[PDB]
Paper text:
The four-component transporter [name] in Bacillus has been implicated in the protection against SDP-dependent killing by expelling invading SDP toxin from the cytosol. [name] contains the ATP-binding cassette ([name]) transporter YknYZ, in which an individual protein YknY dimer associates with a respective permease ([name]) that utilizes ATP hydrolysis as a driving force. The activity of YknYZ strictly depends on two accessory proteins, YknX and YknW. Unlike most dimeric [name]-type transporters, MacB and YknYZ are characterized as non-canonical [name]-type transporters, which consist of a four-transmembrane segment, an N-terminal nucleotide binding domain (NBD), and a large periplasmic domain.
Here, we present the first crystal structure of the extracellular domain of [name] from [name]. From the diffraction dataset, the crystals were found to belong to the orthorhombic space group P212121, with unit-cell parameters of a = 44.2, b = 46.2, and c = 87.5 Å. The refined model of Ba [name] ED contains 188 residues from Asn58 to Asn256, and the N- and C-terminal regions of Ba [name] ED were disordered in the crystal. The [name] ED structure included a mixed α/β domain that was dispersed into upper and lower subdomains. The upper subdomain was formed by residues 103–219 and was composed of a seven-stranded antiparallel β-sheet with four α-helices. The lower subdomain was formed by residues 58–102 and 219–256 and consisted of three α-helices and a three-stranded antiparallel β-sheet. The DaliLite server revealed that the structure of Aa MacB PCD was highly similar to Ba [name] ED, which was found to be the top match and showed a Z-score of 20.1 and sequence identity of up to 22%. We also found this crevice in the middle of the mixed α/β domain in the Ba [name] ED structure, where it virtually divided the domain into two parts (Upper-right). The most significant structural difference is the number of β-strands; the lower subdomain of Ba [name] ED contained three β-strands, while the other structures each contain four β-strands. The purified YknX protein was not bound to the CNbr-activated region, which is in sharp contrast to the strong binding of YknX to [name] ED.
Numbering used by the authors: 16 to 33, 39 to 148, 156 to 214
The structure:
């Protein structure tokens, strides 16, 4: 019962204005009829570093709805709290693979990993294939200057709402951005 929103401007759209979702967008969507939850992330590739070890990782800056909806399961340590998202703490939850690459069999919990030159305390390792770390989206703003989400889905209350909620959510997006039909769900 989730549907993803995409940004694809038409030629009619591009020649009026020479994938971006704002915080305003994420907050608006939550109030769209039929929306149970908003699933939002900013996905970026970069190197992560601990001591003498380097690996390439996926860093996901997410909102509070993302964990909610995604069956993301922490095996050791803890998951994010709503205040972690609020304050944008320098806190990260890492996959088993990236923990193994950077730490081997040593516990990563409490250690500082440097992602793209930014320090992040590992507060959780996920249940078990990819090297990826999750951090509060608000941490991306201050640390990397990332102020938009790259990927957004909405979860509906029921399956029969997808078509209409999806459409409404897409219109809302277009209206916030002043675009005609750039934002859309699959028809």
């Amino acid at each position: 019962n989730t549907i993803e929103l995409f940004y694809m401007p038409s030629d009619e759209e591009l020649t009026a204005n020479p994938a971006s979702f704002t915080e305003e967008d994420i907050n608006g969507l939550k109030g769209v009829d039929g929306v149970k939850q908003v699933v939002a992330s900013a996905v970026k590739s970069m190197t992560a570093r601990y001591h003498e070890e380097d690996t390439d990782i996926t860093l996901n800056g997410i909102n509070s709805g993302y964990m909610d909806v995604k069956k993301l399961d922490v095996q050791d340590g803890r998951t994010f709290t709503d205040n972690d998202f609020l304050s944008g703490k320098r806190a990260g939850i890492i996959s088993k693979k990236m923990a193994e690459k950077l730490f081997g069999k040593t516990s990563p919990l409490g250690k500082i990993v440097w992602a793209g030159g930014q320090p992040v305390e590992v507060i959780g390792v996920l249940k078990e294939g990819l090297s990826e770390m999750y951090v509060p989206f608000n941490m991306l703003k201050t640390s990397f200057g990332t102020n938009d989400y790259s990927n957004v889905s909405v979860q509906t209350e029921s399956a029969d709402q997808i078509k209409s909620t999806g459409k409404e959510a897409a219109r809302l997006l277009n209206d916030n951005h002043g675009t005609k039909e750039a934002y859309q769900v699959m028809n």
